């Protein structure tokens, strides 16, 4: 009896992948400071982002299969190179370094004398600088060299731009949509009872860190435990905190900028003498706040590893510095902190057997993150003492393979892949494409 | 905005206009662009208009020539989801609906462009002469 009829705009979608753009909230642009991080031409965010809750809908999510992570990961990487392209390349810094021990703590800093090319190509320049032990390597008084020269080339980051993370909303173009999981407890896998849609994702700060998720999103009620394959010890375990952890990372060295001239037109910023406290970089964590969280977190692992079992914590096993330490950026400088003091504990079924704690941190200006070869970035010196306060919102953890599985299990800080850091904020999001065209049988026919 | 996706097809016909609007047009709109990350905010919106005109051809070449809803002279085959009328709109949902028609979807498409607007417009030419 009936007849076919074309309906346009029916609620039908399929899971797919597209190219997502950013959103800066149109305030980051007023923050200026010559293109901070991403925001330059960055899409300002709709003042009123729209979130529509879909009733009577259940959708299955997988955060580990999420494509927004891979795009974001490649975005930061592509973003990094574009920042270093217009800046000043440090290529003729491979000159011999004659170094000596700084005036305590086994001479971590080296005072190095070397020859340099001036604006003119005729006469050289005899000048000295100050490099960390991590930035230099001796070759056989004490003679050193740049640590990256044998591996690759090097370029200096511009002092105008800042590495300051700013909120970035990922949005989808026309024909696409972004799904948001509104449940309080979600491990990133399984069906999602309450699903809402948004044009733009929430504020996401691209904070690059290791062993500690900084400035991230808090969980709801109970703390969350996420892992790709849990019984598998080869897979990292992502944790989401309820309450934020106060962390202080400072640069207890009050410095000055040389701004030496290697012209014509170019000026390099050398690290001058340190005026102030003679100290190594340090990281503070309040003993009461970390413990309280630990007691709550260690109980969540027993929802899997069993009601009663012994959970012991320990510092990093070994590997690259990026893996073994907490790597991040504060005030433009890159800190590498020793977390061994926090991870020293042993817990009972519900319990573990002072007013403050500190963590030794190391500073490295010349870095290759993401296993990049051919390009090394030099972090420019900062005037004065740098102080920063951030939230610790989560961790990257790995389980040991030694078993004795039915006895006890030990967990250690993870590292490596930075996608996990983005999976922390993107677990509730996935990309689907909308299929508007539809057909239905009805009597109307046509004349 | 997609709110009736969980609801029945009968209820999903009321908010049909909303999906048409938001889906159709999406301009932020920002002129600024750069050599890298400017090509990223381009490649996305260029694919948007390519996917769009792809849909619009079907609306024109079929018996619609207009948006939202339009009808046709193609009779509904029994072999295509033999059902009850109240079992479709009142008791069933679109996602659940498109699930079954997946086999006959390409067949119906042929009936719209060939059996109608190819043979209908020609029929019209023969009926408009007298």
């Amino acid at each position, epitope marked *: 009896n009936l007849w076919v009829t074309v309906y346009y705009g029916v609620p039908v979608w399929k*899971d797919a992948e597209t190219t997502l753009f950013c959103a800066s909230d149109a305030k980051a642009y007023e923050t200026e400071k010559h293109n901070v991080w991403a925001t330059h031409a960055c899409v300002p965010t709709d003042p009123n982002p729209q979130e529509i809750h879909l009733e009577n809908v259940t959708e299955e999510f997988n955060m580990w299969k999420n494509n927004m992570v891979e795009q974001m990961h490649t975005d930061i990487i592509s973003l990094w190179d574009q920042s270093l392209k217009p800046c000043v390349k440090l290529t003729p810094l491979c000159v011999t370094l004659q170094c000596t021990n700084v005036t305590d703590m086994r001479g971590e800093l080296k005072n190095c004398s070397f020859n340099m090319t001036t604006e003119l190509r005729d006469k050289k320049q005899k000048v000295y600088s100050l490099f960390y032990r991590l930035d230099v390597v001796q070759i056989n008084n004490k003679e050193y060299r740049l640590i990256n020269c044998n591996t690759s080339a090097i370029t200096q980051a511009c002092p105008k731009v800042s590495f300051e993370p700013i909120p970035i909303h990922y949005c989808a173009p026309a024909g696409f949509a972004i799904l948001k999981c509104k449940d309080k407890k979600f491990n990133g896998t399984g*069906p999602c009872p309450s699903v809402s849609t948004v044009q733009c994702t929430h504020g996401i700060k691209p904070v690059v860190s290791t062993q500690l998720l900084l400035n991230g999103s808090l969980a709801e009620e109970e703390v969350m435990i996420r892992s790709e394959n849990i019984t598998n010890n080869a897979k990292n375990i992502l944790v989401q905190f309820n309450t934020p952890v106060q962390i202080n990372c400072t640069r207890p060295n009050n410095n000055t900028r040389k701004s030496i001239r290697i012209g014509p037109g170019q000026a390099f910023y050398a690290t001058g003498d340190i005026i102030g406290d003679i100290r190594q970089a340090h990281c503070n964590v309040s003993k009461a706040t970390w413990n309280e969280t630990l007691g709550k977190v260690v109980k969540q692992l027993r929802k*899997h*590893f*069993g009601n009663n079992t012994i959970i012991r914590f320990a510092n990093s096993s070994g590997g690259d510095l990026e893996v073994t330490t907490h790597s991040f950026n504060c005030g433009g400088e890159f800190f590498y902190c020793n977390t061994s003091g926090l991870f020293n504990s042993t817990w009972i079924s519900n319990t573990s057997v002072n007013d403050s704690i500190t963590l030794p941190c190391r500073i490295k200006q010349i870095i290759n993150m993401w296993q990049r070869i051919g390009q090394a970035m030099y972090a420019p010196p900062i005037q004065g003492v740098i102080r920063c306060v951030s939230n610790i919102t989560g961790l990257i953890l790995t389980r040991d393979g030694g078993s004795t599985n039915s006895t006890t299990e030990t967990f250690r800080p993870g590292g490596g892949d930075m996608r996990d850091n983005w999976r922390s904020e993107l677990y509730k999001y996935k990309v689907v494409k909308i299929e508007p065209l539809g057909v239905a049988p009805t009597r109307c026919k046509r004349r | 905005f997609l709110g009736a996706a969980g609801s029945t097809m009968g209820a999903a016909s009321m908010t049909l206009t909303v999906q048409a609007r938001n889906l159709l047009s999406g301009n932020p709109d920002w002129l600024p662009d750069m050599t890298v990350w400017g090509i990223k905010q381009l490649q996305a919106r260029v694919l948007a208009v390519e996917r769009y005109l792809r849909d619009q051809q079907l609306l024109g070449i079929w018996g619609c020539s207009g948006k939202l809803i339009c009808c046709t002279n193609v009779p509904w085959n029994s072999s295509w*989801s033999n059902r009850n009328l109240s079992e479709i709109w009142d008791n069933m949902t679109w996602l659940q609906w498109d*699930k079954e028609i997946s086999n006959y979807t390409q067949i119906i498409y042929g009936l719209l462009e060939e059996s109608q607007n190819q043979q209908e417009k020609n029929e019209q030419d023969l009926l408009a002469l007298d």
Partner: antibody
Amino acid sequence: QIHLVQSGTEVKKPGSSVTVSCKAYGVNTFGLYAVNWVRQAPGQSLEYIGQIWRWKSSASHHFRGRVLISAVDLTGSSPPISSLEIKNLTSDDTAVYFCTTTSTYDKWSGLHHDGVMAFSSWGQGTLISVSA
Amino acid sequence: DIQMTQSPSTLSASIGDTVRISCRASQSITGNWVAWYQQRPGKAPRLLIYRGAALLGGVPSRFSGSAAGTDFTLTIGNLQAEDFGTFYCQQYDTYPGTFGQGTKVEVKR
């Protein structure tokens, strides 16, 4: 990959209660995977008993309420495990029981049809002989 | 409650032959929700085709399904040794799923 390892052979007497377990190896979770329990009578065809999907246990009108399907997700020491119980055992329940699962993540897959589905992965099977 | 009828209950076919096993449902299944399983003796049954023609990945191209209305048929061309066993047709169209009588594919000689 995906491996479904069930319990050993259970021989039980009428009136008693039986518990079989299904260890699902390779499965990330029962959230993205629906678990169906299917039995096969000797010399006869296959019969669908029940399922647990989106962590919701369900079963056919033959067995309503008399068959209980329970499951726990992936843990830190073992893969996701499901168990099927039949109380008030009789002599007609001697069929061979199979633990099955299907990937439900694909929303437009022909595998599933709103709770009722095909069965992609099959277990080793467990024979239950009820005799005194 | 659907009832699946397979024909025949058992058959004799040789190597290289084209084997056709049909099946009929107590009602008409549209959306083509039908599955075909293979079971070798002493082994758990394996899933071959879903949605009546949609072959699962890793299955040889020799197997072909067909789905129209109440009548369903599975077509196997160029029969080989490993193909012999008992086959079942199943409908997941409605709650609950029901299988067929079963068809024993037996070696010809």
